[PDB]
Each structure stands twice: as C-alpha cells, then as structure tokens.
Amino acid sequence: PAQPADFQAEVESDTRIQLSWLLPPQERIIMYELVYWAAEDEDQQHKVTFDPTSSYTLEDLKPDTLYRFQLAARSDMGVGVFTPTIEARTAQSTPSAPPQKVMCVSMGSTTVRVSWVPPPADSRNGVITQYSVAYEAVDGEDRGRHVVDGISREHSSWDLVGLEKWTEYRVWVRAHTDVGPGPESSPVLVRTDE
C-alpha cells in the first residue's frame, strides 16, 4: 500500500486536466483511487477508480475553477496513504450566456441609452473584459448594422448617439473575455424620441 510519488497536475485546456505520477517499481498495485473536488465547493467531492496506469486525464470540468487532487494505490493489503493534496486551476473560455436584463430607453432625437447586467457567474468562464453593443435600424435612413466594441466592464449602460429620429431599432449586446466573445442577447425593440 505504498503512497505513489512524483504526483503532478498539468492544465491541458479549460476543461481538461492531466494528472501524472511515477509508477511504482513493479509493486502489486490492484487499482488507483483518485479523489478530487472543487476548491470553492468542499461539500461535493468526487472519487474515481481506474486500472494501474502512469497518467490520468480528467474531462468535462468547469472553466476558471480550482480543482484539488489526492491519489492513493490499493494493493492486496488495502488502500494506501493518500498523496499530499495538489491543486490546479482550469483555463478560461468564452462566456456561455448572454448579458441578462437587457433594456434601452430613448434619450432624445439621436440618442438611445441601452442598459444590461453581467451574465450569471456559473457561465462566465473567466473574467469579463469588455462588452459590445450591436444594433440595426428599421425605419431609419440607412438599414446598416452598427456595433460598438471596447465597452469596458465598469459600466452597465452605454449611450448610442447619432442615430435617426422617430424610428425603431433592434439592440444586441454580448460579453467578452480574452478567449473570445460570448453569445449575444435577445433583441429588444426601441423607438426613437422626436
């Protein structure tokens, strides 16, 4: 029941972590027992048993989450001593949800202010870096899509200026991270004040 040595975690992707360790010098190991859990949620811990191998990769994980691991080998004597716990955090990814509670109210003849709220945390998959408001006119002079990038994460509302007068618009807004942009919000209608 010797504790496995040289236990090391490697971050392969945003949802896949590879665990490696030194195989014992021909020790009569039956199975390996791996126990891991999310650092933010200690109550739910996961356990997996597998045949004697040198490495094991975990899949279907959550991005931007810290996972801690412990390993032991069970022989004909029983389950050995667990390895000292190691931790590894998954990489970031694009958001899996649009900004919620999207709204917009006309401010004047050529100004329309749009507001939103950051998406839920369980689908952010990283740090929200910026936003992007997309909109198209309907009854306006030009029916051309316009988008505004670089919307910093500090504010939750942006003012669209220079548009047409007394006309309807559709608005879209999506979250952004270093990996890429997330899904856009559902379109919301708005009519320009005159």
Swiss-Prot record:
Residues 182-194 are annotated as: Disordered. Coiled coil: none annotated. It is found in: Membrane. Residues 3-93, 98-194 form the Fibronectin type-III domain. Interacts with GRIP1. Interacts with PPFIA1, PPFIA2 and PPFIA3. Interacts with INSR. Belongs to the protein-tyrosine phosphatase family. Receptor class 2A subfamily. This is Receptor-type tyrosine-protein phosphatase F. The chain holds residues 512 to 705 of 1907 of the full protein.
